[PDB]
């Protein structure tokens, strides 16, 4: 009934939740964390290279995030819930969750797939610079497919940006920074709606979010648009021009990020529609993949 959590007290939670997390739990024996080897740029002090042994021999290269012990009942239930949700998600352009390794009265371990080429923003910025404009558009198409899947699960991301997507060995893009992969440089776990005072990604936010701080799939669409802009500019900062405190007035005037050179015109059109003042008028992620795909296929311009 509680085969992987029998040794820790989760009685304060809903029993249905607890048995539901069982399949997400990984046993300590199956995981070797290489604590002297930190992942990528060392930008997340709490994430290390790991080796996950599965069913058969199956040795798997992974990224292991260590979190501070969670002592609040509400946050523990949030934590486990997000685990189940991410674990059950399954899409080629959505970062998956291998599982969580739980110990009593201690630090939870988030086990994620190792992403050989790090984050998208940095990738399009160094000299493994093989991507062409068409490839760049291709990356955007992948993000859109990932977002389409998320949206169909009624999952609002709230922080979509090039820095928050990863690339594996086959250069497959994965939308990250969500669920248990959200805020990875933070050792403390925080529920989505329980991180009062958090820094917001102002230059990636939709006009209505900048004023109400409410996010929807439509506001994620606005963010996708800026994400697209980042791609076509190979990682340029949006609005280096305007101060974060002036962004809202800037957009209310109708101003927008300018079309970068080489960015095909119909693609820029896609960006502009993503930045429509009325959220209901923006394209859904389904339509996004359709148009981008069409643009991508009939290009090499």
């Amino acid at each position: 009934l509680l085969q992987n959590t029998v040794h820790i007290d989760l009685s304060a939670l809903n029993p249905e939740l607890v048995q539901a997390v069982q399949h997400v739990v990984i046993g300590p024996s199956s995981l070797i964390v290489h604590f002297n080897e930190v992942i990528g740029r060392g930008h997340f002090g709490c994430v290390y290279h790991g080796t996950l042994l599965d069913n058969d021999g199956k040795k798997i290269h992974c990224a292991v995030k260590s979190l501070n012990r969670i002592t609040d009942i509400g946050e523990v239930s949030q934590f486990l819930t997000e685990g189940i949700i991410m674990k059950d998600f399954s899409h080629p352009n959505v970062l998956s969750l291998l599982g969580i390794c739980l110990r009593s009265e201690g630090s939870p371990l988030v086990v994620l797939p190792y992403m050989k080429h790090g984050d998208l923003r940095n990738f399009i910025r160094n000299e493994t610079h093989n991507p062409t404009v068409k490839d760049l558009i291709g990356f955007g198409l992948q993000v859109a497919k990932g977002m389409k899947y998320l949206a169909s699960k009624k999952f609002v991301h709230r922080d979509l940006a090039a820095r928050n997507c990863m690339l594996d060995e086959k250069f497959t893009v994965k939308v990250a920074d969500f669920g248990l992969a959200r805020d990875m440089y933070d050792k403390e776990y925080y529920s989505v709606h329980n991180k009062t005072g958090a820094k917001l990604p102002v230059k990636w936010m939709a006009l209505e979010s900048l004023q109400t701080q409410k996010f929807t799939t439509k506001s994620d669409v606005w963010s996708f648009g800026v994400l697209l802009w980042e791609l076509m500019t190979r990682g340029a900062p949006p609005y280096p021009d305007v101060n974060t405190f002036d962004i809202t007035v800037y957009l209310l005037q109708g101003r927008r990020l300018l079309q970068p050179e080489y960015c095909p015109d119909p693609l820029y059109e896609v960006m502009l529609k993503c930045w429509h003042p009325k959220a209901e008028m923006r394209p859904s992620f389904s339509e996004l993949v359709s148009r981008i795909s069409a643009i991508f296929s009939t290009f090499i311009g």
Side-chain angles (χ1 to χ4, degrees), residues 18-54:
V18 179
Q19 43 212 23
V21 305
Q22 234 51 234
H23 74 286
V24 195
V25 181
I26 295 170
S29 302
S30 312
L31 183 70
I32 295 170
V33 190
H34 305 277
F35 291 110
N36 292 304
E37 292 175 43
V38 171
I39 289 284
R41 268 177 138 161
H43 268 77
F44 324 126
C46 53
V47 179
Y48 323 83
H49 286 275
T51 299
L52 176 70
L53 351 157
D54 202 304

Side-chain angles (χ1 to χ4, degrees), residues 281-301:
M281 297 298 95
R282 298 168 198 155
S284 69
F285 277 110
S286 182
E287 332 200 272
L288 260 338
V289 36
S290 290
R291 335 193 167 188
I292 309 278
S293 179
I295 299 178
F296 175 76
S297 304
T298 66
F299 177 92
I300 218 79

Side-chain angles (χ1 to χ4, degrees), residues 259-270:
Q259 153 170 40
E261 49 177 44
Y262 311 144
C263 169
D265 285 282
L267 218 230
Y268 186 55
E269 194 203 321
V270 164

